[PDB]
Amino acid sequence: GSFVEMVDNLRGKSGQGYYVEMTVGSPPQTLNILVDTGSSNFAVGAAPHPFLHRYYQRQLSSTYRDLRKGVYVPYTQGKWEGELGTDLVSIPHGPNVTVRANIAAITESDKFFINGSNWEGILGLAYAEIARPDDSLEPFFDSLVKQTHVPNLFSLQLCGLASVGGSMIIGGIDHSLYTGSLWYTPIRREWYYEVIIVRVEINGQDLKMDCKEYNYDKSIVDSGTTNLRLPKKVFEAAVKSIKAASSTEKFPDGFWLGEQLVCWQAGTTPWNIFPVISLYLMGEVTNQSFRITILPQQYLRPVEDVATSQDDCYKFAISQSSTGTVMGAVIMEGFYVVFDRARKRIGFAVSACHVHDEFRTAAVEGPFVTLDMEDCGYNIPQTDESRSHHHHH
Numbered sequence: 001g002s003f004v005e006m007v008d009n010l011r012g013k014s015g016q017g018y019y020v021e022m023t024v025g026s027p028p029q030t031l032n033i034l035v036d037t038g039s040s041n042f043a044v045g046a047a048p049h050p051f052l053h054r055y056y057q058r059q060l061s062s063t064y065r066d067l068r069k070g071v072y073v074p075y076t077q078g079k080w081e082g083e084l085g086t087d088l089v090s091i092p093h094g095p096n097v098t099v100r101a102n103i104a105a106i107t108e109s110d111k112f113f114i115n116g117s118n119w120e121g122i123l124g125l126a127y128a129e130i131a132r133p134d135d136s137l138e139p140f141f142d143s144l145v146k147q148t149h150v151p152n153l154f155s156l157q158l159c160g161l162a163s164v165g166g167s168m169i170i171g172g173i174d175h176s177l178y179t180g181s182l183w184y185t186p187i188r189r190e191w192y193y194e195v196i197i198v199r200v201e202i203n204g205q206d207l208k209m210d211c212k213e214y215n216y217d218k219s220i221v222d223s224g225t226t227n228l229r230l231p232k233k234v235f236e237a238a239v240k241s242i243k244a245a246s247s248t249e250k251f252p253d254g255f256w257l258g259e260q261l262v263c264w265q266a267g268t269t270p271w272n273i274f275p276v277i278s279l280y281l282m283g284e285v286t287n288q289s290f291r292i293t294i295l296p297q298q299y300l301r302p303v304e305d306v307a308t309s310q311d312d313c314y315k316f317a318i319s320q321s322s323t324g325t326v327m328g329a330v331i332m333e334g335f336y337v338v339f340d341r342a343r344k345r346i347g348f349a350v351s352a353c354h355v356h357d358e359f360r361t362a363a364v365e366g367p368f369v370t371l372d373m374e375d376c377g378y379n380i381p382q383t384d385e386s387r388s389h390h391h392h393h
């Protein structure tokens, strides 16, 4: 399983993430597993569901061990719950290794498995601190690295209902997947893949906010989120700016809320009137940053319609957040993204699968120098619950 074996090992549907094949148990049961850098549990459907046709059957695995401990995971949008255990786990199109990992067997869920998305489970690739029920449940990637010689790194090339492809290179960086410079921003703290944005520009114009507003209350890289999600004040200033640039076209309010498609005659979409967005990320060097520049074709996402085959129709894929900035697939589909856990940094390069425009290019460019920052990171108010918990590791 050299890096040629791992190229193209991702599939998905637009708007429902990317999954990789994994096997669980002995004899191996093959499942499609969502790649989720925004959570830290490995959890698989483990009972029948109307929208699943396979699921992990613990009773058919000779290597399964029950940990006799439940877990309940709520989301704003639904939930999953299940029974913790361990089993043997392998990635057939990844490194040639097998490991004993924690697995949550999902026994009940609500609004988690969607009609026809094709994944049966989720691979949380973030760190132990945010694992449920607590940080004592070792995430999959920590077990992989500890049990094998796989380097403590992985990279994602997400390529963008329409079918999508990409690659997850486990343990390395595949130079066939990008062009140009790889630029690294630091992992601010190991929980989410948290990073710090220092400046935002919409068509070359600076939003000019206090840069802490960009990271309120965090900014994270999240392959499990579709949109670019922006804190309220940032989202408002962004919408004001894009609306200004595209003011030839008066769209309804529901479009800007992502609740409604806007259309043009097939092949005639005026791409030029929608501006590029540049996010400047903290550099590895003090006072330096680099920018990642997003095309309009990344944040206005085509949705094919029944009554409008005559037309190219689009949904606005930037949305307001109350939980900080989220660089989801909208951002990641431009780029080859390196999750360099060994060196506590995330790299960005232009992807070999480009999502292209007539006259502009998704880009990664630096350096840009200032006088930083003067600290653009936000310090989340410490709860008594947080404060009192002992971490004896």
Ligand SMILES: CC1(C)Cc2cc(Cl)ccc2C(N[C@@H](Cc2ccccc2)c2nc(=O)o[nH]2)=N1
Residues within 6 Å of the ligand: 015, 016, 017, 018, 034, 036, 075, 077, 078, 079, 080, 110, 111, 112, 224, 225, 226, 227, 228, 229, 319, 328
């Ligand atoms: C990682 C995962 C599966 C967690 C989740 C749990 C639940 Cl219960 C509902 C939706 C999501 C979700 N929603 C994604 C969309 C999605 C749905 C399914 C697979 C991948 C991504 C999202 N993007 C966004 O801008 O807001 N929510 N992503």
Ligand SMILES: [Zn+2]
Residues within 6 Å of the ligand: 021, 092, 093
């Ligand atoms: Zn296969």
Ligand SMILES: [Zn+2]
Residues within 6 Å of the ligand: 390, 392
């Ligand atoms: Zn103690």
Ligand SMILES: [Zn+2]
Residues within 6 Å of the ligand: 135, 136, 390, 391, 392, 393
């Ligand atoms: Zn702890």
